[PDB]
């Protein structure tokens, strides 16, 4: 009864792996991170501003 | 159409309440005051040698007070 | 925004003081000489130094 139902679709299925929010999860080739968390890991991922 | 053509021969400097009007020295080429040099106000971009057309030869401009 | 930067005006004076005979009025020549004499990696600053030394060498003989 204390289990969360199994969802493959919708926001409740997708969660950011770092922060844990249920909101903005960019999935370009499988990142699983929130949109703002993406900035605190930008330069470790190899990304560079141009 | 009793208009008088004339030639821009010198530009004193940009004038007018917004910098659009240009104070030009224009020499009359055809009319009663043939050859008179008068400071006249021009709207629209102007150069040296442009054929202005004038309604009144009597009109002049006050000296710019910088 | 023409103005040649300060450190270019500083570099060129020394460059032409040490090797005055090396430089002439030709821009490509003085540019190659700046390239071989200095260690600039930016092509643009190399050519700017070339232009300023071109003008400098030009003034050397005018007075």
């Amino acid at each position: 009864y204390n289990k969360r139902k199994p969802r493959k679709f919708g926001k409740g299925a997708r969660r950011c792996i770092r922060c844990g929010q249920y909101g903005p999860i960019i999935r370009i080739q499988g990142l699983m991170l929130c949109r703002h968390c993406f900035r605190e890991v930008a330069p470790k991922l190899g990304f560079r501003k141009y | 159409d009793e208009g008088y053509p004339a030639e821009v021969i010198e530009i004193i400097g940009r004038t007018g309440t917004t910098g659009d009007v240009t104070q030009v020295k224009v020499r009359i080429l055809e009319g009663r005051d043939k050859g008179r040099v008068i400071r006249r106000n021009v709207r629209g971009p102007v150069r040296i040698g442009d054929i202005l057309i004038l309604r009144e030869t009597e009109r002049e401009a006050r000296e710019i007070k910088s | 925004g023409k103005i040649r930067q300060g450190f270019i005006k500083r570099v060129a004076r020394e460059l032409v003081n040490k090797y005055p005979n090396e430089f002439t009025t030709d821009f490509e020549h003085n540019k190659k000489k700046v390239q071989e004499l200095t260690n600039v990696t930016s092509k643009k600053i190399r050519n700017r130094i070339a232009g300023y030394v071109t003008k400098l060498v030009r003034m050397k003989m005018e007075g």
Binding site: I28, F47, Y50 | - | -
Partner: protein, 102 residues
Amino acid sequence: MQKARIKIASTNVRSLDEVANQIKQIAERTGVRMSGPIPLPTKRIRITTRKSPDGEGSATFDRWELRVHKRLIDIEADERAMRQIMRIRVPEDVTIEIELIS
């Protein structure tokens, strides 16, 4: 006749050129015809994100770009040549895929 198609991919251009030079030197020292490194279309991964951490503020956005570059090396088949591409010192970021084509 048989050819080996070697696809090298990396982010830093210098590592890819290093491995290309090593492969070219090895192919020429082994005396094997090698089709030179063909630089394939670099893939540009572009991501846009709003810089505002909250709903308050002017809408400012930032675009970041990965330029992942790739090269193709088609060499002729030679076992002595194929024994000297597993011993090459490969930088970590460089990925190499070596397939065979009739």
